[PDB]
Amino acid sequence: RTLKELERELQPRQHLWYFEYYTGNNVGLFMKMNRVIYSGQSDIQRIDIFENPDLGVVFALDGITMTTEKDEFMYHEMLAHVPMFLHPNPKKVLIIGGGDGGTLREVLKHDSVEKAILCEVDGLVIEAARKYLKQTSCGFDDPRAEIVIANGAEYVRKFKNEFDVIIIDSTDPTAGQGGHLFTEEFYQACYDALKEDGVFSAETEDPFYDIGWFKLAYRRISKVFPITRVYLGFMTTYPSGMWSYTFASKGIDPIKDFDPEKVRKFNKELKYYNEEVHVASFALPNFVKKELGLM
Amino acid sequence: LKELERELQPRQHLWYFEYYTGNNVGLFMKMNRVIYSGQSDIQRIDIFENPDLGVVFALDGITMTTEKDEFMYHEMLAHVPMFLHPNPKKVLIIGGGDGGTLREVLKHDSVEKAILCEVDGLVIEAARKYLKQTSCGFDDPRAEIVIANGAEYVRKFKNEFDVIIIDSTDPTAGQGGHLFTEEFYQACYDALKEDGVFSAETEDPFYDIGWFKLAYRRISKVFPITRVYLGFMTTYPSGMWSYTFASKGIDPIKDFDPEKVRKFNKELKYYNEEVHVASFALPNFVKKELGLM
Amino acid sequence: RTLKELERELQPRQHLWYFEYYTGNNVGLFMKMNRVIYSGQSDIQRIDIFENPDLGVVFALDGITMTTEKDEFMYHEMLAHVPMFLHPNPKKVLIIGGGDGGTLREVLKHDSVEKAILCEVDGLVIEAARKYLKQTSCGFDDPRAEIVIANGAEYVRKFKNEFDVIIIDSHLFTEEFYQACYDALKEDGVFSAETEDPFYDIGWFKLAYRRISKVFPITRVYLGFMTTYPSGMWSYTFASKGIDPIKDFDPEKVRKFNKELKYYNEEVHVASFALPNFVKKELGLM
Amino acid sequence: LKELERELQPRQHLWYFEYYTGNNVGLFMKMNRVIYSGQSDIQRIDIFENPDLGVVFALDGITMTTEKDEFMYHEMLAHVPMFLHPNPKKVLIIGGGDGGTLREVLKHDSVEKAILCEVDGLVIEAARKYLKQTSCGFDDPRAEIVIANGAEYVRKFKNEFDVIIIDSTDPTAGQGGHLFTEEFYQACYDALKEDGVFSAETEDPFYDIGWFKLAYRRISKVFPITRVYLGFMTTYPSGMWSYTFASKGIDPIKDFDPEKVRKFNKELKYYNEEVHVASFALPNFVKKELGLM
Ligand SMILES: NC/C=C(\CCCCCN)SC[C@H]1O[C@@H](n2cnc3c(N)ncnc32)[C@H](O)[C@@H]1O
Numbered sequence A: 001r002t003l004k005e006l007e008r009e010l011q012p013r014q015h016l017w018y019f020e021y022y023t024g025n026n027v028g029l030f031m032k033m034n035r036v037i038y039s040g041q042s043d044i045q046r047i048d049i050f051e052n053p054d055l056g057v058v059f060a061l062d063g064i065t066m067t068t069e070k071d072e073f074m075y076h077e078m079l080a081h082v083p084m085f086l087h088p089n090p091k092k093v094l095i096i097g098g099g100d101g102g103t104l105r106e107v108l109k110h111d112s113v114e115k116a117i118l119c120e121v122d123g124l125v126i127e128a129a130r131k132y133l134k135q136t137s138c139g140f141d142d143p144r145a146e147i148v149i150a151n152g153a154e155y156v157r158k159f160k161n162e163f164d165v166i167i168i169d170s171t172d173p174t175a176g177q178g179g180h181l182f183t184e185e186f187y188q189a190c191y192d193a194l195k196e197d198g199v200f201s202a203e204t205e206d207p208f209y210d211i212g213w214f215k216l217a218y219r220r221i222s223k224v225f226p227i228t229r230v231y232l233g234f235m236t237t238y239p240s241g242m243w244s245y246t247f248a249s250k251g252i253d254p255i256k257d258f259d260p261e262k263v264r265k266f267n268k269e270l271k272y273y274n275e276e277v278h279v280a281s282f283a284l285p286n287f288v289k290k291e292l293g294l295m
Numbered sequence B, D: 001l002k003e004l005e006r007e008l009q010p011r012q013h014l015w016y017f018e019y020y021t022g023n024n025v026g027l028f029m030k031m032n033r034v035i036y037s038g039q040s041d042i043q044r045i046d047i048f049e050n051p052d053l054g055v056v057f058a059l060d061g062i063t064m065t066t067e068k069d070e071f072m073y074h075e076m077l078a079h080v081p082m083f084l085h086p087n088p089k090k091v092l093i094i095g096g097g098d099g100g101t102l103r104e105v106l107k108h109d110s111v112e113k114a115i116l117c118e119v120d121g122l123v124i125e126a127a128r129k130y131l132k133q134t135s136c137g138f139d140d141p142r143a144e145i146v147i148a149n150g151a152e153y154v155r156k157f158k159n160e161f162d163v164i165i166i167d168s169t170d171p172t173a174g175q176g177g178h179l180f181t182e183e184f185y186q187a188c189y190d191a192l193k194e195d196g197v198f199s200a201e202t203e204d205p206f207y208d209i210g211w212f213k214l215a216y217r218r219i220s221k222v223f224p225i226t227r228v229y230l231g232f233m234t235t236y237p238s239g240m241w242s243y244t245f246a247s248k249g250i251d252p253i254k255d256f257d258p259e260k261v262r263k264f265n266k267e268l269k270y271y272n273e274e275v276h277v278a279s280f281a282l283p284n285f286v287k288k289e290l291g292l293m
Numbered sequence C: 001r002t003l004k005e006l007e008r009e010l011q012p013r014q015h016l017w018y019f020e021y022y023t024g025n026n027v028g029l030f031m032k033m034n035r036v037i038y039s040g041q042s043d044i045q046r047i048d049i050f051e052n053p054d055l056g057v058v059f060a061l062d063g064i065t066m067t068t069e070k071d072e073f074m075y076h077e078m079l080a081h082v083p084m085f086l087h088p089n090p091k092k093v094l095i096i097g098g099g100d101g102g103t104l105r106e107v108l109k110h111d112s113v114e115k116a117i118l119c120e121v122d123g124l125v126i127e128a129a130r131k132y133l134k135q136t137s138c139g140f141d142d143p144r145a146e147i148v149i150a151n152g153a154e155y156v157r158k159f160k161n162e163f164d165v166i167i168i169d170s171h172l173f174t175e176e177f178y179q180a181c182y183d184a185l186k187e188d189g190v191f192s193a194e195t196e197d198p199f200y201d202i203g204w205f206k207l208a209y210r211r212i213s214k215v216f217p218i219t220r221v222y223l224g225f226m227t228t229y230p231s232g233m234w235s236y237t238f239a240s241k242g243i244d245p246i247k248d249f250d251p252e253k254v255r256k257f258n259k260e261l262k263y264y265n266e267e268v269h270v271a272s273f274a275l276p277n278f279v280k281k282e283l284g285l286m
């Protein structure tokens, strides 16, 4: 008999675990692993993809949770739909980071899109996502999607008055090639690469374990864009579960220029984002307002 | 020994592991020191110090409060129904042995009497001794602390309270479950005055989806107005916590007066007027689980 | 550009771990995992094979550590060589369990062996060992080796006055099973069974000894270090129909052995039978 | 509060993790409660209760003693040299603040003076209060506790002691520690009388193979007779522990009289005549490491 003939459905036990440490290394998340699907090392970072009984397939970079099959929609829908719905007619989009493809998948739901560029620094992440993370990488096959392997901070500088929307889907500033995507100069390059009525969004971490970088990202973006507003969203497997995103534009206000009918009439599936959540996400708790210097 | 002791420094050897429902995911925290470990006839109490979260309080290995973020939970559970009530004078809080909810309730000058009904006397005593940050309202003359099963205690009252807040452990944890039956919610309804309001912690709609749904269905079957609101809770399972507001007619949005919150003469670290309204906007997956979509 | 073309040597971090809980679930061993080589489930149990930076390839069954490349020799040499060297001319050997192949590998070092049957209950363990545990399964293809997929307690009762040596590697602990091994051995046959650590598994250690002692006239416990098994103190039980492990031991056979031994030697053979007081007390040997 | 307290039961939330050299493997233990955590100017002390092992004492997250099995280590470290000496009257023990080695040494009626030289006074104080199983001999009229650095202390003596035993010291400094230098071993040699004997714990020849080889090499450059012996130690890294016996002529096998052990009037839970001799039989890998094949 051969191995395959004798194999049965793999059942989880209490012996294999994934431990993710949060900034500071005093608190973290642990997950049981039924099996490890892939472990790879590029010139940039380490990729691990495994299966958890409750979360499904989990993707991690350098021991930091990037996506889980059960809840990635929460993050990708909030990072992409806010700017996409606010733009009058988004045709050309640039996504920096997001090798898993989730943000690209959400952006592609918008019929106005003619070209979506996914600029990921690590080619191995793209290859691993194409093969093992089909839930998020389904957009790779879209005729309008173009994948570019490059450092986003260097890539965006090559363009001026080119994009309608730029979305930053980066790792933590201290993780991997992240950090390059957090400079004031970088944000200026994004501003210069957008057209006159362009919009922008960037993941700005949890205002809890990563309060430092959250504040810094907001300061730098607000110094470049006339309109800069932080919005929050639940993210059930990210550090603290309280995630922040920063919307920015050259005039379009995230509340005053929001047309709820665009969302009500959307022809694609949305598992988190909706008209009420859009406006609600901009309501900040007092401690967050205090950090940003608002109240 | 006393002369030789120095400030205790954290290492990587002592840990607290909190398993979430299902035992497949959990949270881990480094422990610099264990302040107290005690066992009552009901459950086990552990209070320890974590370098980032400060003092941590756990019941049967489940995180109850953290010095760094407990305000997020307590402010949302308490201030939503308190600010919606026209003039809350008499309040009943079931559970909440740590005292956080009582503390928030006491910030409203309108309160003349607030009963804190905790089932475990050991929790009250541990909170008084080690959790000063949340048990600060224990000596307030308006506060009355009683030890009893809230499910039975509430039955002593009819047309008595302006606000009833359920600050309970999980439906499967230490004496909980008594606080999640339809019989219980009806008694809460009966214990409230004609225009009374209500709030109850209804778990995270992620690891504890089952109990979240059941709590909503049971509450909605008793109260004419039943609405779920959400809030961030940085150290609770999933970080997405739900609370269910209920009333005999008062609407959480339609009858909300943002001015009352703006002119509030007390400190609020999470809750505010825009957050109050925003907390009721539910993401699609939550609406779907509740049959609201 | 290509996936394989972008891959580099995998570096160990602090996020993947293997936790082995000991009997009682109050203490255990943890190991960092650089990668998981194989995870599979048979009708009988779960197999996990992974790589640890210090121990090398690690093989676990149902979350219990079975072998480690760094130290498996300690266990396999003590379980196998004590009975093999004590037998005057071991030609036919039966090994029950030992799916990894380690005991089989040690037994095959003895030139007198003509046939060594490896009776493993789970075929998936044999196939996984053949593919991923080359260090221990190297004897699978030896013409003298015969692999049988069967329950050892059922398989052994098919034989009478057949084997010179029987070794029980980690139904296989009943008095009737031991009696079946006794009946399957020749008049001068010898036996060894791994009998656990007299620490976390003291209950089973005592029971195994009692049961073996009710069948074999000569029953003697010996001990050895096993650096990755629970407690590090492992016991083995030698048994026979007359051959004494100390009195009939010939040191010269070991001194002149022409095969590699990384643990076992003539001094260790005799020393392994010296039992600390707490062990003697547990077995009632004063 | 004490009136409400019941016997504390262990759950699955509190843990102690010990990392072995290399940090790729380690041991974890469940904690029912933490008895004492303290920090001296030298190291951190943690004493807790484990359901199977009883009271556990760890220094800087390295397991030093466990109630269930400390006898294995202390008996082998102390009894081998004690029974080999003709008439041990004056004994010096360096390290071992828990007191176990001292306890075993005191079982020998010939002893008139046994000095326990511990570098950290907090260890002695904590052992008195929380490690009664091992510190029971601290107040024996023949015992003297000295708080000092053993490398400095031993140099104050010449032709003074019958037996010197080096218990655990500075676990975190590894082979580079002050108690593993040729200079220190020479000071020990000089402090011993003409027919003195010596033993030192020399680590596990698995995770700490280098440290083990270094200790043996340095001890052997000083003493004419140097022999490694091994013992089981059920909660130490790898479970295979080594000890190095040394003397100015007394041979551990040629001068061993089993009758002294057989007639011993005190309790021994590990050590006996067969084990004495057997502990000197080294597996091939150990012999190769020491250059004895
Ligand atoms: N989409 C949810 C997870 C994202 C991340 C958010 C999860 C946060 C968790 N705490 S993946 C972030 C990706 O951004 C890439 N990224 C990092 N640096 C650069 C760069 N300089 N140029 C382009 N792409 C980059 C990484 O290689 C990674 O694949």
Ligand SMILES: NC/C=C(\CCCCCN)SC[C@H]1O[C@@H](n2cnc3c(N)ncnc32)[C@H](O)[C@@H]1O
Pocket (backbone or CB within 6 Å): B059, B062, B063, B064, B065, B073, B094, B095, B096, B097, B098, B099, B100, B101, B117, B118, B119, B120, B123, B148, B149, B150, B151, B167, B168, B169, B170, B173, B174, B175, B176, B178, B179, B201, B236, B237
């Ligand atoms: N205040 C934030 C923490 C609360 C916890 C919120 C849960 C968070 C989970 N992740 S503590 C809940 C308290 O409710 C008490 N409680 C349980 N059952 C009863 C009962 N039948 N009658 C009265 N009080 C009771 C418990 O003993 C516990 O002290």
Ligand SMILES: NC/C=C(\CCCCCN)SC[C@H]1O[C@@H](n2cnc3c(N)ncnc32)[C@H](O)[C@@H]1O
Pocket (backbone or CB within 6 Å): D059, D062, D063, D064, D065, D094, D095, D096, D097, D098, D099, D100, D101, D117, D118, D119, D120, D123, D148, D149, D150, D151, D167, D168, D169, D170, D171, D178, D179, D236, D237
């Ligand atoms: N006997 C079993 C437990 C011992 C430990 C054995 C555990 C082994 C684990 N792998 S505790 C050893 C004590 O020796 C002390 N020691 C360290 N340095 C010195 C010094 N310079 N002079 C005197 N005593 C010292 C330590 O402070 C420690 O408390």
